[PDB]
Subunit: 43 residues, 2 copies
């Protein structure tokens, strides 16, 4: 089983239900989810 997850933010960010503690929200994905961009600090 896989999941096809969208990479949002013009290929920089990931669509999530909820952003991780070391990510910033930078918008919404069309499916509803948050678009989440890593801080350098996340890794």
């Amino acid at each position: 089983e896989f999941e096809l997850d969208r990479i949002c933010g013009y290929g920089t960010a990931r669509c999530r239900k909820k952003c991780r503690s070391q990510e910033y929200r930078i918008g919404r994905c069309p499916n509803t989810y948050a678009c989440c961009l890593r801080k350098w600090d996340e890794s």
Copy 2:
């Protein structure tokens, strides 16, 4: 751009670089990643 992510743990868990704070590690995915199972508490 998408990413095809593996659902591990016999369809219960997700492969991640690092498990989220309200997930438990329940193994490794073949690509190297942690297999991460949600607590009821994650959601």
